[PDB]
Ligand binder design. Structure first.
Ligand code: CLA
Ligand code: CLA
Ligand code: CLA
Ligand code: CLA
Ligand code: CLA
Ligand code: CLA
Ligand code: CLA
Ligand code: CLA
Ligand code: CLA
Ligand SMILES: CCCCCCCCCCCCCCCC(=O)OC[C@H](COP(=O)(O)OC[C@@H](O)CO)OC(=O)CCCCCCCCCCCCCCC
Lengths: 40, 162, 153, 80, 141, 90, 742
């Protein structure tokens, strides 16, 4: 349990989780606010 | 059992091996009877033979594959090209001889046979010997080119490919 | 307008581009039943294109002699929404990231083997640090005055 | 022949000598270090310049330095 | 130590290879490594292949000093055999090389004088302009 | 049993003449006399190099200068009216 | 004696070693000091023989890794079947395979990417696929989307099974070393058990599920009214109408009247005119014969009873006057070295993949595969690349065996010893052969280019000029075309339409196959192929043979298999390790395979593929321009590279727009690789020294000290990016061209 939490804190796993969350956020923003060239 | 491949001359620490390609009696005799390995005879005659063979062999490609191959003058043009190649080869031989051999130095050829018997080293590896060899080569090559031309386009013998 | 450009609500090339895009989309509509799902999907694309062009008209963008929007960066007060405001937002996010990274690197520096917290991240410590970037300009300024920002070697 | 030089930052752990592929270096008595020995290069004519000694040098900076110089048949590793 | 001379001892059993001596040994030099073995055994050759070392004296001729030293270190590490090697010239001159003092060079020994030892740190070498238009190098000073 | 002798370095290092033959001349005496007589001028390496280079250069220049339009298209020259340029240039 | 030998609970299942990166090696387990550690962890992950010296421990690891790989492959197959069942137009393609393009991928409507859902036909929008799964599914008799869903579920279950098997055999029941070294039993089981029984089962499926459903499909009946496969087993009457011989049951099989089964077991040759592929009745008989052959083959070796052969006995009895003791000692080498077995298997598999690629285009086995040009080109190129990579890996692992596991004192072999005793002769002869082939192959192209540029078309090497006819290949073609009449009397047609039987098969107004003519241009490309193959062989064989030692480095074995150099001494000793030789040979393998696939593409588009009208006239894609244009480098530059790239460069704004983007990306990556290939790490470490100062000035310097990539790692990165960019450029260009124009 402790060892598995230590493994999930390793660089590649944390990196893929973080970038997946970022990609999902950006994708949803672009889905609901598409084609933004300026900032109104 | 019975192995065929042996170390060269019985010495396992010389960088070669004895194989049927290199040490069979037929190939050994054939190589020993070529003009390039006739140690005890004037290099001029050996060069004559070598040039006679090579200039004769050089005529065909120039005559048949050349730019003017389809012209009625193809034979003479190809023979002239072969003669020019022989001249260039003689120039290269003279250059190598001048660069490699000094007039006073003795021969660089080995003085032992395969059986360890002392022999006279080849005079071809001297300045005078090489000069005689290249002169003979030039004279033989020009004559061979002329002979091939005479056989092909002066007597017009029914050769299949001309 | 600026640099000889005309607003995209006036330029005829912009409207011609919008008409040609819709015509290109409507040619593939002919190959499907009027009630099919591909016909419903190309119609959504047509509405998306109409909304895009209408928005580009409304925001007040300048278009060249090609019918395409052109950005104005020099600092004009009526074109701040193309470079200045997005740039400020980017500079706020990037400074946030940099400051959270710097604080985490400082926090693990004084340990026995600090290279193990750089490949296996102390997630609770990162959670503590992360939300300090919301006020990163204030702290970054304040360590400039005191002298805790730059190492004087 | 390349040039091999030894500086007094030597600690005399003999690492260069046993890394020599052509027996160029050796160890000689000394008094400037705790080991009471320093390296020497009396046979640089057999040097090939592979710089294996510098890879075995623990001192910072290197205590044995190899400078590539005039090339001979021995220094180019030619067997023909 | 008085260096040992070169007898006519036998050679390891080998079938021959194309990696042996070339004409450089005829005109420039070659090398001879001699050792003593307690039993007949297999050993890899530095020129490729495996040979049989005989019990008693063993003599082997090679093209380079590096080959001789590589074979010697392999013998010392694997078979625990002491070795020597010499340089032989076309005129029959033999030059004893290693072990030069009778002691291997990684072991300190009296009677050796330092060659190429600089009594300074590597950072105290002078700049090139100080040796410009002279024939000397900065590390030779 | 041994292949290392200090008195015989040539045998030790393999300085052998493998295919060299010490047999007498296999050529006929009259033919050898003829070739010796008529190839003697070409046995001077200093003279041969100069003669070959200079005579070959002169022969090459002469043959190139005597070539006709049938042998070389470059000697024949153009036979067709010239093409015009992209925008009326000649 | 041959028996199951296992060890119980050898390794405890715990998460403790997951939290300790680098646990598998002594050096890496201590943690990182610089960034090099991070790379060293990934480079040594699967180097099992470097982790431990125990052969049994290594063997158990490879045994479990194979189970993991099998689980991954099963997951991939399950995904393919699920996407065929859920996101494909397979059921519409079944009713009109000549006018509908296969598609099994549909993209989401985000950021405008929904343009990639093109009009593939059948009321479907998606991405056209070139894997050939639709034709294989049609051949297998698959008719509905439900049977693909069940296959996906079964593949998922099998993937779970393989994963559990790997865990169980590494942690619960680990086989002993003696179990792995039972090579006779393994060979017997893989020959008779795996291959023989697998082919027998597939033959049964073909004669029971494939033949009837495909007979219904080729007759022109709707797929939705074909009886289900089990209906052909339940009432045999349905099977006794297509083939009345089934009414006899298995009596003809047991009474040795096999000609009674001639209805569905045939020896025809050629192609099915309705389908354009091999006759299914031929394929079923092929598999049934292969099953018997392999079942008999798998009974050759002795395991526990007296009958059978001993592999060591066979090996030790093959020796002669030129090879000394012969093959004695090879059994010990091949039963104690994983790397030698890996090398041999990689070479054989890579060679077999190329044969598969060559045979699949000339004898299309699947229905409606020949007239789907995009699938054919993609399959050929894919299998060529796979074969080349496996062949290169064979040389790499042979070099690894030479460096590590070679030991003449305990594992001597006369053949390997004698090969190492004349390696100079081998390498010099291969060098001469490479130079001769390079001249007499490529310099002919330069001669042709110069003659064409000089206004002398009559002096070139061409069919209207000096000819170089491949007379031997022409004779082989003529011999194979006459086989049905004299040398294969029971065969009706030749094994391929390309031999020259003077017939062409057309399906849907499209040419499937026709006699392929050979001329001077083919003579040129074939010798070009031979030259590149010889150069790759030279590079790899020189690395394998000179890995342990050379005249430059007498002790190259002590430096390892993968080292950068041995210093600037001896004039310079860069890239002397066996690893570098593989690194260099990858480029030449890439060159050779690129030339082969370019040859295939141009020849197929010029002389085979095309369209046929209802008059009898054939019009090829490029109109037979290969013979007169593929003889100059300018011809390849203009009529192939420039002419056929016009598709991928005008694909913007269409469904093929993803191939132009990949075209540019591949060019970018290929150019990017040259930074790594042309430079060295000494410059980059010094450059990093200045950036580290800037970070230290702002107190943001990491504890893990930044290091430039190692000398060997930079070469690996450069070659990987080079290969990726090069292969992706052709992938995009080929796919765009053959989808737009094919
Ligand atoms: C430095 C180069 C660069 C720059 C400046 C941009 C800039 C932009 N790209 Mg772009 N792009 C780039 C490289 C770049 N890209 C590359 C290399 C690719 C290839 C992969 C793409 C592929 C691409 C696509 C496919 C699309 C864009 C789009 C956009 C626009 C996005 C607007 C948006 O989503 O706002 C909304 C986002 C925010 C406001 C950010 C919020 C961040 C956080 C959550 C804020 C919350 C905390 C405060 C914007 C103008 C999109 C667009 O509409 O273009 C007109 C679009 O569809 N780009
Ligand atoms: C480009 C290659 C080439 C070409 C075009 C020729 C062309 C020719 N050779 Mg030739 N030759 C060559 C290479 C070539 N050779 C080589 C490499 C050798 C070995 C040294 C020879 C040795 C050789 C001899 C010994 C003779 C020729 C002869 C000939 C001529 C008649 C050949 C014939 O009718 O045979 C037709 C038969 C076949 C093609 C079979 C012809 C001009 C003959 C000649 O000139 O007679 C006056 C002659 O006697 N050749
Ligand atoms: C703590 C993170 C951090 C910070 C504060 C900086 C800060 C700086 N870097 Mg830098 N850098 C970083 C990480 C960081 N870097 C990493 C990870 C790399 C390797 C890819 C580099 C590679 C790099 C180069 C090659 C150069 C700089 C340069 C610079 C300076 C100019 C700004 C610049 O060019 O940014 C550009 C920054 C990058 C290209 C890298 C950004 C990488 C990501 C965004 C950082 C992520 C940090 C970490 C993962 C998050 C921490 C999470 C934690 C809470 C658990 C500036 C002092 C330049 C310089 O010295 O000129 C003055 C320069 O030439 N950096
Ligand atoms: C090699 C096998 C393979 C491949 C290449 C694909 C590829 C694809 N499948 Mg697929 N599939 C497969 C096997 C495969 N599948 C199998 C075996 C099944 C049966 C179970 C399916 C069932 C299936 C369905 C049912 C669907 C797909 C879909 C898709 C497509 C979109 C996938 C996607 O966006 O992921 C979705 C994204 C993720 C799964 C996220 C990635 C997760 C990683 C670990 C990162 C996690 C970070 C996370 C996202 C951040 C938030 C975390 C949280 C803590 C904050 C894509 C082409 C979809 C499609 O084509 O739509 C039209 C679709 O609907 N597949
Ligand atoms: C049930 C869970 C479980 C647990 C707790 C362990 C625990 C352990 N195993 Mg074990 N193992 C398991 C399941 C498990 N295993 C299964 C199912 C298999 C069969 C494949 C194996 C096969 C196996 C072998 C062969 C070995 C171990 C070893 C070990 C030990 C250290 C391994 C380690 O650090 O893993 C951390 C490593 C990982 C988490 C890597 C997992 C990578 C997966 C399997 C492959 C997926 C990659 C895929 C291609 C990704 C593609 C996308 C990418 C491009 C982004 C440890 C005691 C090793 C040992 O004893 O140490 C000496 C050892 O040699 N195990
Ligand atoms: C008829 C018996 C039989 C069969 C069918 C196989 C089949 C296979 N063996 Mg194998 N093997 C056998 C007997 C058999 N072996 C014996 C007797 C020995 C000891 C001498 C070995 C020792 C052995 C080793 C050391 C290795 C294999 C491997 C493999 C796989 C090669 C990969 C492949 O072709 O994928 C084909 C894939 C399929 C056909 C998919 C279906 C999977 C099959 C049906 C499962 C096999 C079940 C097995 C025979 C018995 C299960 C035990 C039972 C208690 C459940 C393949 C699944 C290699 C491998 O990948 O390991 C995992 C490997 O490294 N075998
Ligand atoms: C492993 C492959 C395989 C499998 C599982 C089957 C399975 C089957 N076959 Mg079969 N078959 C096969 C290969 C296979 N076949 C091949 C290769 C041929 C060509 C020679 C045939 C030719 C064949 C005929 C001609 C018939 C079957 C029949 C049958 C069925 C009943 C067999 C029975 O119990 O009576 C025989 C079993 C024993 C004597 C034991 C059964 C479903 C029979 C059937 O009911 O058809 C639907 C039937 O009439 N098969
Ligand atoms: C079944 C085949 C097979 C097997 C079992 C092995 C197994 C092995 N090889 Mg090997 N090899 C193979 C095929 C195989 N190889 C082939 C075909 C080649 C020729 C290319 C090589 C070339 C090769 C070399 C040159 C070396 C090995 C080495 C090794 C050993 C260490 C492997 C390791 O730790 O890698 C760790 C794995 C990685 C570091 C991952 C690398 C990721 C690659 C480079 C990216 C591939 C690109 C990808 C497909 C595209 C992704 C796109 C991206 C945007 C996501 C191991 C025993 C090494 C060794 O020391 O052996 C003892 C070694 O030096 N092999
Ligand atoms: C287009 C670029 C190019 C070319 C022409 C070559 C050429 C060659 N490489 Mg190569 N190479 C290249 C790029 C290239 N390489 C790159 C990028 C790499 C890095 C991966 C390598 C890596 C590499 C390795 C690792 C090896 C080679 C080898 C070879 C040689 C193969 C033998 C051969 O074909 O000789 C024939 C010569 C040619 C085809 C050259 C063209 C000659 C034509 C006919 C014109 C000549 C006319 C005339 C002589 C001009 C005289 C005029 C006068 C005024 C001078 C040959 C010299 C191998 C080798 O040396 O084996 C012998 C080898 O092992 N190369
Ligand atoms: C070519 C003539 C030929 O292939 O003869 C084949 C010849 C046969 O050798 P043996 O009959 O002595 O070999 C007996 C066993 O090794 C066969 O299993 O092999 C060699 O002489 C070694 C050189 C092979 C590579 C030669 C190139």
């Amino acid at each position: 349990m402790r060892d598995l939490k230590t493994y999930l804190s390793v660089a590649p796993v944390l990196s893929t989780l973080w970038f997946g969350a970022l990609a999902g956020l950006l994708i949803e923003i672009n889905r609901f606010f598409p084609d933004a060239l300026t900032f109104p | 059992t019975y192995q065929v491949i042996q170390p060269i001359n019985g010495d396992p620490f010389i960088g070669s091996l004895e194989t049927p390609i290199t040490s069979s009696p037929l190939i050994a005799w054939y190589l020993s009877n070529l003009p390039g390995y006739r140690t005890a005879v004037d290099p001029l005659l050996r060069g004559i033979e070598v040039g006679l063979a090579h200039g004769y062999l050089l005529v065909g490609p120039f005559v048949i594959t050349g730019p003017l191959r389809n012209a009625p003058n193809h034979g003479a043009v190809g023979s002239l090209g072969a003669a020019g190649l022989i001249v260039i080869l003689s120039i290269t031989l003279t250059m190598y001889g001048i660069a490699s051999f000094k007039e006073g130095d003795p021969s660089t050829a080995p003085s032992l046979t395969l059986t360890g018997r002392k022999k006279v080293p080849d005079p071809l590896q001297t300045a005078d010997g090489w000069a005689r060899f290249t002169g003979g080569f030039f004279f033989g090559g020009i004559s061979g080119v002329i002979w091939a031309y005479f056989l092909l386009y002066v007597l017009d013998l029914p050769y299949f490919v001309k | 307008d600026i640099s000889g450009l005309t607003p995209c609500k006036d330029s005829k090339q912009f409207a011609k581009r919008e008409k040609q895009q819709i015509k290109k989309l409507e040619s593939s509509l002919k190959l499907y039943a009027p009630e099919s799902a591909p016909a419903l999907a190309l119609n959504a694309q047509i509405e998306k294109t109409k909304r895009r062009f209408d928005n580009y008209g409304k925001y007040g963008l300048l278009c060249g002699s090609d019918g395409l929007p052109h950005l104005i960066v020099n600092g004009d007060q009526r074109h701040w929404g193309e470079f200045i405001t997005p740039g400020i937002l980017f500079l706020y996010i990037a400074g946030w990231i940099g400051w959270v990274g710097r604080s985490y690197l400082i926090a693990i520096s004084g340990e026995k083997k600090p290279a193990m917290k750089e490949i296996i991240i102390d997630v609770p410590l990162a959670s503590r640090i992360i939300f300090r970037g919301f006020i990163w300009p204030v702290a970054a300024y304040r360590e400039f005055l005191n002298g805790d920002l730059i190492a004087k070697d | 022949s390349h040039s091999v030089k030894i500086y007094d930052t030597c600690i005399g752990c003999t690492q260069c000598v046993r890394a020599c592929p052509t027996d160029v270096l050796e160890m000689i008595p000394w008094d400037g270090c705790k080991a009471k020995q320093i390296a020497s290069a009396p046979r640089t004519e057999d040097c090939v310049g592979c710089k294996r000694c510098e890879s075995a040098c623990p001192t910072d900076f290197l205590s044995v330095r190899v400078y590539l110089w005039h090339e001979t048949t021995r220094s180019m590793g030619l067997a023909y | 130590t008085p260096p040992q001379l070169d007898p006519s001892t036998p050679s390891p059993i080998f079938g021959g290879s194309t990696g042996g001596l070339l004409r450089k040994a005829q005109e420039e030099e070659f090398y001879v490594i001699t050792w003593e073995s307690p039993k007949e055994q297999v050993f890899e050759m530095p020129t490729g292949g495996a040979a049989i070392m005989r019990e008693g004296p063993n003599l082997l001729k090679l093209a380079r000093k590096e080959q001789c030293l590589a074979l010697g270190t392999r013998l010392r590490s694997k078979y625990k055999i002491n070795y020597q090697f010499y340089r032989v010239f076309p005129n029959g001159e033999v030059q004893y090389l290693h072990p030069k003092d009778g002691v291997y060079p990684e072991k300190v020994n009296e009677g050796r004088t330092g060659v190429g030892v600089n009594l300074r740190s590597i950072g105290k070498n002078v700049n090139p302009i100080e040796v410009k238009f002279t024939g000397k190098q900065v590390y030779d000073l | 049993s041994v292949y290392f002798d200090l008195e015989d370095i040539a045998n030790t290092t393999g300085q052998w003449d493998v295919y060299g033959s010490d047999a007498p001349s296999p050529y006929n005496g009259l033919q050898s006399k003829f070739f010796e007589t008529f190839a003697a001028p070409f046995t001077k390496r200093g003279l041969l190099l100069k003669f070959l280079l200079l005579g070959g250069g002169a022969t090459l220049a002469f043959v190139s200068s005597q070539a006709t339009g049938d042998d070389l298209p470059i000697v024949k020259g153009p036979q067709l009216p010239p093409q015009p340029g992209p925008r009326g240039k000649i | 004696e041959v028996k199951i030998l296992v060890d119980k609970d050898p390794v405890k299942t715990s998460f403790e070693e997951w939290a300790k990166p680098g646990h598998f090696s002594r050096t890496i387990a201590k943690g990182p000091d610089t960034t090099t550690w991070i790379w060293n962890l990934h480079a040594d992950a699967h180097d099992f023989d470097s982790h431990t010296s125990d052969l049994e421990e290594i063997s158990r690891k490879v045994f479990s890794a194979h189970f993991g790989q099998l689980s991954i492959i099963f997951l991939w197959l399950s995904g393919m079947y699920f996407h065929g069942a859920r996101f494909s137009n397979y059921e519409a393609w079944l009713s009109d395979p000549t006018h509908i393009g296969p598609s099994a991928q549909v993209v989401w409507p985000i950021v405008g990417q929904e343009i990639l859902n093109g009009d593939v036909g059948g009321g479907f929008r998606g991405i056209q696929i070139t894997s050939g799964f639709f034709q294989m599914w049609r051949a297998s008799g698959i008719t509905s989307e439900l049977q693909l869903y069940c296959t996906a579920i079964g593949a998922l279950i099998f993937a779970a099974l393989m994963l559990f098997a790997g865990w169980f055999h590494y942690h619960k029941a680990a086989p002993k070393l003696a179990w792995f070294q039972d090579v006779e039993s393994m060979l017997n089981h893989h020959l008779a058990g795996l291959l023989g029984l697998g082919s027998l089962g597939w033959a049964g499926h073909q004669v029971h599920v494939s033949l009837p459903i495909n007979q219904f499909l080729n007759a022109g009946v709707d797929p939705k009214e074909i009886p289900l496969p089990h209906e052909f087993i339940l009432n045999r009457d349905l099977l006794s109408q297509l083939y009345p011989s089934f009414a006899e049951g298995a009596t003809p099989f047991f009474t040795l009247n096999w000609s009674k089964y001639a209805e569905f077991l045939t020896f025809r040759g050629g192609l099915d005119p309705v389908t354009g592929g091999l006759w299914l009745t031929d394929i079923a008989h092929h598999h049934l014969a292969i099953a018997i052959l392999f079942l008999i083959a798998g009974h050759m070796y002795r395991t526990n009873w007296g009958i059978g052969h001993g592999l060591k006995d066979i090996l030790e009895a093959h020796k002669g006057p030129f090879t000394g003791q012969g093959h004695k000692g090879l059994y010990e080498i091949l039963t104690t070295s994983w790397h030698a077995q890996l090398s041999l298997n990689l070479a054989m598999l890579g060679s077999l993949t190329i044969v598969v690629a060559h045979h699949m285009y000339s004898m299309p086995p699947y229905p409606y595969l020949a007239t789907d040009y995009g699938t054919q080109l993609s399959l050929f190129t894919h299998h060529m690349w796979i074969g080349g990579f496996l062949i290169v890996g064979a040389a790499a692992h042979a070099a690894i065996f030479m460096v590590r596991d070679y030991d003449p004192t305990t594992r001597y072999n006369d053949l390997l010893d004698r090969v190492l005793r004349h390696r100079d002769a081998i390498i010099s002869h291969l060098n001469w052969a490479c130079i001769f082939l390079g001249f007499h192959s490529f310099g002919l192209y330069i001669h042709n280019d110069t003659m064409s540029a000089l206004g002398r078309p009559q002096d070139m090497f061409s069919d209207t000029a000096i000819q170089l006819q491949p007379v031997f290949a022409q004779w082989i073609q003529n011999t194979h075309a006459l086989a049905p009449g004299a040398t294969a009397p029971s065969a009706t047609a030749s094994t391929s339409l390309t031999w020259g039987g003077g017939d062409l098969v057309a399906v849907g107004g499209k040419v499937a196959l026709l006699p392929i003519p050979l001329g001077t241009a083919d003579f040129l490309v074939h010798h070009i192929h031979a030259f590149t193959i010889h150069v790759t062989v030279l590079i790899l064989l020189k690395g394998v043979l000179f890995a342990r030692s050379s005249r430059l480095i007498p002790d190259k074995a002590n430096l390892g298999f993968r080292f950068p150099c041995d210093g600037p001494g001896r004039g310079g000793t860069c890239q002397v390790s066996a690893w570098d030789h593989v690194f260099l040979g990858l480029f030449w393998m890439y060159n050779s395979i690129s030339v082969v696939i370019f040859h295939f593409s141009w020849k197929m588009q010029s002389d085979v593929w095309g369209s046929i009208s209802d008059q009898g006239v054939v019009t090829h894609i490029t109109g037979g321009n290969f013979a007169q244009s593929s003889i100059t480098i300018n011809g390849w530059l203009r009529d192939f590279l420039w002419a056929q790239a016009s598709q991928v460069i005008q694909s913007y704004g269409s469904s093929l727009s993803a191939y132009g983007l990949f075209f540019l990306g591949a060019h970018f990556v290929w150019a990017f690789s040259l930074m790594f290939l042309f430079s060295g790490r000494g410059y980059w470490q010094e450059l990093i020294e200045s950036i580290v100062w800037a970070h230290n000035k702002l107190k943001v310097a990491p504890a893990t000290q930044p290091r430039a990539l190692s000398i060997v790692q930079g070469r690996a990165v450069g070659v990987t990016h080079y290969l990726l960019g090069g292969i992706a450029t052709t992938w995009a260009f080929f796919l765009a061209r053959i989808i737009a124009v094919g």
